Amino acid sequence: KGKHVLVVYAALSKQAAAYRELSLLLRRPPGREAYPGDIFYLHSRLLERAAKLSDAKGGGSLTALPFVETQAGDISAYIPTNVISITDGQIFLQSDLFFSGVRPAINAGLSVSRVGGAAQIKAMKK
Amino acid sequence: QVSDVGTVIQVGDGIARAHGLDNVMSGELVEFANGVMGMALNLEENNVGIVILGPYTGIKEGDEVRRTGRIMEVPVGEALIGRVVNPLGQPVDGLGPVETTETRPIESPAPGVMDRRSVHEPLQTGIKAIDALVPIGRGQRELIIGDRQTGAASVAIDTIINQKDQNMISIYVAIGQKESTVRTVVETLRKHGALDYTIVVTASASQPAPLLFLAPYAGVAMGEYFMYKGKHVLVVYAALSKQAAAYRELSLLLRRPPGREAYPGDIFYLHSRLLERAAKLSDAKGGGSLTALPFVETQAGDISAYIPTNVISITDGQIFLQSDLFFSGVRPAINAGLSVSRVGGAAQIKAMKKVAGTLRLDLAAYRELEAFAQFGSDLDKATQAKLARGARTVEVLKQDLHQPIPVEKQVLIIYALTRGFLDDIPVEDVRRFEKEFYLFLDQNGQHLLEHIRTTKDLPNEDDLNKAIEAFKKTFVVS
Amino acid sequence: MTRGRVIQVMGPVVDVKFENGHLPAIYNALKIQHKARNENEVDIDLTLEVALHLGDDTVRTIAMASTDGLIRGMEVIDTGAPISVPVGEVTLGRVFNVLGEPIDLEGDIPADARRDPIHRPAPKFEELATEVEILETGIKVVDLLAPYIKGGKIGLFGGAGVGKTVLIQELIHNIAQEHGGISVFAGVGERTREGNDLYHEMKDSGVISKTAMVFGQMNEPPGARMRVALTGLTMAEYFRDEQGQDVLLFIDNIFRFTQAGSEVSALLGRMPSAVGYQPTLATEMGQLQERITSTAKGSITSIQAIYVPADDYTDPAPATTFSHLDATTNLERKLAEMGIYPAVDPLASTSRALAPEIVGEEHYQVARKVQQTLQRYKELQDIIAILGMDELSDEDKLVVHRARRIQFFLSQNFHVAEQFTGQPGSYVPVKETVRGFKEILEGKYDHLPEDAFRLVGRIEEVVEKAKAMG
Amino acid sequence: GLTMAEYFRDEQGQDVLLFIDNIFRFTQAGSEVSALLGRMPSAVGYQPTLATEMGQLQERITSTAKGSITSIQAIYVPADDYTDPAPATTFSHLDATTNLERKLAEMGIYPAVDPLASTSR
Amino acid sequence: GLTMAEYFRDEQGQDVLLFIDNIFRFTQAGSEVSALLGRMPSAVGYQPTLATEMGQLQERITSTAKGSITSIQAIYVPADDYTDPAPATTFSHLDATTNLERKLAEMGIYPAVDPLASTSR
Amino acid sequence: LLDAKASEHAARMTAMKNATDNANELIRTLTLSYNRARQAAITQEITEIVAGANAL
Incomplete structure (x- = not known):
């Protein structure tokens, strides 16, 4: 219709777990870590609808901020790899600094916004 | 309508499928045409999955299958003492048949949670290390886990022999052991004179899988008779791992769905059902007890496997045996660092309780400083004292084979070591010192021995110190 | 009708058959009571719960006890509701x-x-x-x-x-x-x-x-x-x-x-x-x-x-x-x-x-202070065990004193332990315990021996016990 | 795309550059469709016919007597597991390797290509 | 081979030796044949009947009253993994162990048997 | 001489402390990788077994 929307999925990890359970119940063969091979398509089909339309189409927009739950801060896992491949960039939170009560570490080492930078206004860019 | 007869359809690998037998019950006993026994496991809509209990090469498709109507049962009685019997109840040692006049089903409910009483009596194994550090009380199910060639059967045989004087009746169950080893074990037991109060149940590796699967249950069912008559029983299994392997093979052959490591779904149920029948009955039931000492073998000390994990979770504690220590020469090479016994504390007499703690802390302190011994730069007053004490304690804890030590002499030597009286004897003569001390105590320590025997309490400390001082004076250093 | 009969037994898993159109719903319970009609049978009393519908008016259930002695043909009674x-x-x-x-x-x-x-x-x-x-x-x-x-x-x-x-x-x-x-x-x-x-x-x-x-x-x-x-x-x-x-x-x-x-x-x-x-x-x-x-x-x-x-x-x-x-x-x-x-x-x-x-800002601050003091004490213990308290500065000595007092004050007596000790126990309210901990942190009661903080609970009992030994 | 380029190779007789975006997605889609087709899986659940599918693709990109076609193919490995069957298969058909480096890029050089890890037959 | 030896054990009543080059190949052959026979797989693809058939082979190698058969079975497990089911199963029957060492061989002693690694029951 | 000996002991202090810290840091990552490897091995084995059973 032409407005701007923000959508925040909560646990794509638990959604993937639910889909894995459904697949294994439907008697389909699993893959790596018992995940069926369709998981990447399942995530991409969902996330790919988040895009900024042209001015001709209506000038709308839709931004998404999905979360992922990791174990022991391991990015190597299958679902983190899939989502990090699909997404434009990631914001990592460090568990150790959460003990000191700080807002959890926005670890600038791994955090990156490839699409961003053009979005910041010049005032904050300076 | 065929009701008690049926015909074979398929044969192979000890598994037979029969057609008919509509009035059979799951777990029943079935007799073939040539006399081979069989038990029916699976009851499908048109075929009855039968498991063969003998040499199955003689069964052709089309054989007649008969019914017996008896749930699986084993002979039991007082006549079985001093015989070697396969799980089915037949003697394999000649010497005529048995005279068992009563039988009981191999599958019985375990005693209820309202019929049990807290364990409060000691089980004297006669091994100084375990008796002092990881005690076992009657009614406790304790697991002895170790790698191959680590004296597991040695410990089993010593603790079987050591029960000669007490009221215990011991049953040894051999699963998957070589017939040669079983024969030698029987011979050494006979030579030591333990065969007058023990029963041996054997299932060699050459026997079909169901016999291996049934051996532990036959042993426990044999023991429960003396349970409920009011005596005390001790039972030992060697290979719960091999029994699990046999059951897995049977389930896989019968086309049952697999799980972890191809094991069927109910392997934990099997092991728990086997082991939970070992408890200490309340006084209303007669006061019997049955303690179990299963053995589990791990390859290169991998306790992370499915079967060892399950047995560890089921049982009441572990006794660890170390391949490296056994190779070094330490006998029995008990890894007291990792062994635990939750029942312990209440399972020891007061005389041993008053002395065990100090020795335990001494071993705990020494164990962490074994790397300090390479250099004399050690702080002498504390660290070198700990090293000397630990070496002396370890040397005391070493022991030979097939020589159980009475508890009074055990506590005597432990007290002498704990009270620092051995800091002077060279560490390379402690074994000779110990043997000579036992001889001297047999010579004139009979009063202290009698007091300990009749009161479970330490003797008078002054007299004990006087006697040990006299022996120390009369000893000669080499 | 409620009557149904067994057709398949595989270990703990049993299968039942009912007349068409009268199948029980999922998770229901099935009662089996049988009397030994002759000597080739055994009395059985077993309760199953329904898990899957396999079609053909059959049901796949699981057992709650031993399945030995089951015969293909026993009547099965449906309760119509899950386990009660x-x-x-x-x-x-x-x-x-x-x-x-x-x-x-x-x-x-x-x-x-x-x-x-x-x-x-x-x-x-x-x-x-x-x-x-x-x-x-x-x-x-x-x-x-x-x-x-x-x-x-x-x-x-x-x-x-x-x-x-x-x-x-x-x-x-x-x-x-x-x-x-x-x-x-x-x-x-x-x-x-x-x-x-x-x-x-x-x-x-x-x-x-x-x-x-x-x-x-x-x-x-x-x-x-x-x-x-x-x-x-x-x-x-x-x-x-x-x-x-x-x-x-x-x-x-x-x-x-x-x-x-x-x-x-x-x-x-x-x-x-x-x-x-x-x-x-x-x-x-x-x-x-x-x-x-x-x-x-x-x-x-x-x-x-x-x-x-x-x-x-x-x-x-x-x-x-x-x-x-x-x-x-x-x-x-x-x-x-x-x-x-x-x-x-x-x-x-x-x-x-x-x-x-x-919990409140005051409670949160007291808790954080206790946490960091105990952590600092843990850090200093390793060096102190080899060097002695001599090398400790005055401030770290005060920290160690307060940390020992706090760690001992964390203990409590129990109404349960009365049977073995005789102490009537205590039930310490949150406000009282946080106030006491803040006051101990302030150093007000640093002159008391540490053992006066052993098994009291409330802060008043501490001073009463300390006076008790004097 | 390949059959669009082959016409120009075999008719105009001119050298053609073919860029394929990510070749791993090709075998991933093959794996996804094989299970629905009904063939049993492979080591890591991939389709059985992975090798022959990749061969049928790559073997049409060759030089002939009257023109040539060369491809630049980007590579992506799942979980950075260089022993996975898809990378293991695709690495057999390569002739050259070029590596880009953020260090050189941020230093300011602008071919952004590492001169040390770039090998070639 | 075993039934060749048993006749001399029982009728001649004399001690008889017996060498088996590689029992790993024997259990591998059993594993290979089982799958085509149609039985379900086991832990690492072996047959379910592994333990029973190995025991049936080994238990005829014993010592009776009037004779004996002693065996020297060589073992070489590729990849050097002693936790594999076949080596684990066969190690339950061994009564000794001997280690030949190229270190002593090049030092210049025969039969170059390791004096430390070698054990015995 | 005495200054040199004291400084030597201080240097050994610092070097060995750093060595122990690095050893522990290596240990934690080694254990993490070990756990991941064990989980992957068991899951792959289970998948292989179940696929082999279903194939018949």
Whole structure:
């Protein structure tokens, strides 16, 4: 219709777990870590609808901020790899600094916004 | 309508499928045409999955299958003492048949949670290390886990022999052991004179899988008779791992769905059902007890496997045996660092309780400083004292084979070591010192021995110190 | 009609056939009562629960006991509803198996008693409480460092011989005494003799007069070892709803519940999930935990013991459990060896309630100060054990003094330990304990000997005891 | 895309550059469709016919007597597991390797290509 | 081979030796044949009947009253993994162990048997 | 001489402390990788077994 929307999925990890359970119940063969091979398509089909339309189409927009739950801060896992491949960039939170009560570490080492930078206004860019 | 007869359809690998037998019950006993026994496991809509209990090469498709109507049962009685019997109840040692006049089903409910009483009596194994550090009380199910060639059967045989004087009746169950080893074990037991109060149940590796699967249950069912008559029983299994392997093979052959490591779904149920029948009955039931000492073998000390994990979770504690220590020469090479016994504390007499703690802390302190011994730069007053004490304690804890030590002499030597009286004897003569001390105590320590025997309490400390001082004076250093 | 007959027996899994159009719904219970018609039969009494519909008017069920002696052709009676369990005050002071039949020798429940289904939909969105509350337990360490939330789940780590049973008894007794709320214990997959000893201990201590126990032994089939937790929960739900009072629910082991679930799923024949667990592990855990909530007129708070397999915190079962926990308390051998009770770890233990928006800024600041002081003391201990207190500066000596005082003050006497000591115990309110800890932090009572902080509780008892020895 | 380029190779007789975006997605889609087709899986659940599918693709990109076609193919490995069957198969058909480096890019060089890890047959 | 030896054990009544080059190949052959026979797989693809058939082979190698058969069975497990089911199963029957060492061989001693690694029951 | 000896002991202090810290840091990552490897091995074995069973 032409407005701007923000959508925040909560646990794509638990959604993937639910889909894995459904697949294994439907008697389909699993893959790596018992995940069926369709998981990447399942995530991409969902996330790919988040895009900024042209001015001709209506000038709308839709931004998404999905979360992922990791174990022991391991990015190597299958679902983190899939989502990090699909997404434009990631914001990592460090568990150790959460003990000191700080807002959890926005670890600038791994955090990156490839699409961003053009979005910041010049005032904050300076 | 065929009701008690049926015909074979398929044969192979000890598994037979029969057609008919509509009035059979799951777990029943079935007799073939040539006399081979069989038990029916699976009851499908048109075929009855039968498991063969003998040499199955003689069964052709089309054989007649008969019914017996008896749930699986084993002979039991007082006549079985001093015989070697396969799980089915037949003697394999000649010497005529048995005279068992009563039988009981191999599958019985375990005693209820309202019929049990807290364990409060000691089980004297006669091994100084375990008796002092990881005690076992009657009614406790304790697991002895170790790698191959680590004296597991040695410990089993010593603790079987050591029960000669007490009221215990011991049953040894051999699963998957070589017939040669079983024969030698029987011979050494006979030579030591333990065969007058023990029963041996054997299932060699050459026997079909169901016999291996049934051996532990036959042993426990044999023991429960003396349970409920009011005596005390001790039972030992060697290979719960091999029994699990046999059951897995049977389930896989019968086309049952697999799980972890191809094991069927109910392997934990099997092991728990086997082991939970070992408890200490309340006084209303007669006061019997049955303690179990299963053995589990791990390859290169991998306790992370499915079967060892399950047995560890089921049982009441572990006794660890170390391949490296056994190779070094330490006998029995008990890894007291990792062994635990939750029942312990209440399972020891007061005389041993008053002395065990100090020795335990001494071993705990020494164990962490074994790397300090390479250099004399050690702080002498504390660290070198700990090293000397630990070496002396370890040397005391070493022991030979097939020589159980009475508890009074055990506590005597432990007290002498704990009270620092051995800091002077060279560490390379402690074994000779110990043997000579036992001889001297047999010579004139009979009063202290009698007091300990009749009161479970330490003797008078002054007299004990006087006697040990006299022996120390009369000893000669080499 | 209700009559149905057996057609297939495979170990613990049994199959039934009914007349078409009269099949029981899922999760129902089937009763089998048979008399030995002759000597080639055995009397059987067995209860099954319906799991799957295989079509052709057949049903796939699982057993709750031994299946030996079953014959293809026995009549099967359908109850028409899931397993029913007696509820009410009659359950208190009794021990039940999974089916609601008493295990002890006190007698059978009369048949007219109200019974409730095991399986039940979780409470709707509307009935939930709109805000968070703090459960005041009266044990200084927990209500200071790791508070318990009304309606939340609490994890409890620790091995044997650490006082876990003593802590359980003290929690039950304090909750009963100060809130009029009953408690329920559910021994999922316990060792039989350990359960018997726990029962004897509770009966001797007299706590059992206001509790109800459900025991599922390790020798039971996976069906019972799965349903014991649910029957305990449905025992507690009656008190939450009808009585409108706060209740405590314990679970002896939840990892064993998950393991039993995996075994029953493997028996059913579904393909295993990641590490061989059932595919439905997440939803089964959800259907269990989601009924432990806090509503507008009651609450259920759960204390669950967790055993980690192979000491791996990323294993699927520990991960799934930790996805639900609100707090964690750890019991330590070292604190056990020192004369400190309840020997709970003051550093490893943590909570979600430790936030100024919940407990208050003053409580939060006192807790943080205590945490950092204890951490600093732990850091200095290693160097001090080899160097002596001489090298310690004046400020660090003061820190060590205050840290020793605090660590000793964390201990408490128990109403339970009266039978062995004679101390009448104590129930320390949150406000009193935080005020006392802040004052001890301020250094006001630094001149007293450390042993005056041993087993008192309230801050007044400290000075009274110190005066007692003078 | 390949059959669009082959016409220009075999008719205009001119050298053609073909860029394929990510070749791993090709075998991933093959794996996803094989299970629905009904063939049993492979080592890591991939389709059985992975090798022959990749061969049928790559073997049409060759130089002939009257023109040539060369491809630049980007590579992506799941979980950075260089022993996975898809990377293991695709690495057999390569002739050259070029590596880009953020260090050189940020230093300011603008071919952004590492001169040390770039090998070639 | 075993039934060749048994005749001399029982009728001649004399001690008889017996060498088996590689029992790993024997259990591998059993594993290979089982799958085509149609039985379900086991832990690492072996047959379910592994333990029973190995025991049936080994238990005829004993010592009776009037004779004896002693065996010297060589073992070489590729990849050097002693936790594999076949080596684990066969190690339950061994009564000794001997280690030949190229270190002593190049030092210049025969039969170059390791004096430390070698064990015995 | 005495200054040199004291400085030597201080240097050994610092070097060995750093060595122990690095050893522990390596240990934690090694254990993490070990756990991941064990989980992957068991899951792959289970998948292989179940696929082999279903193939018939």
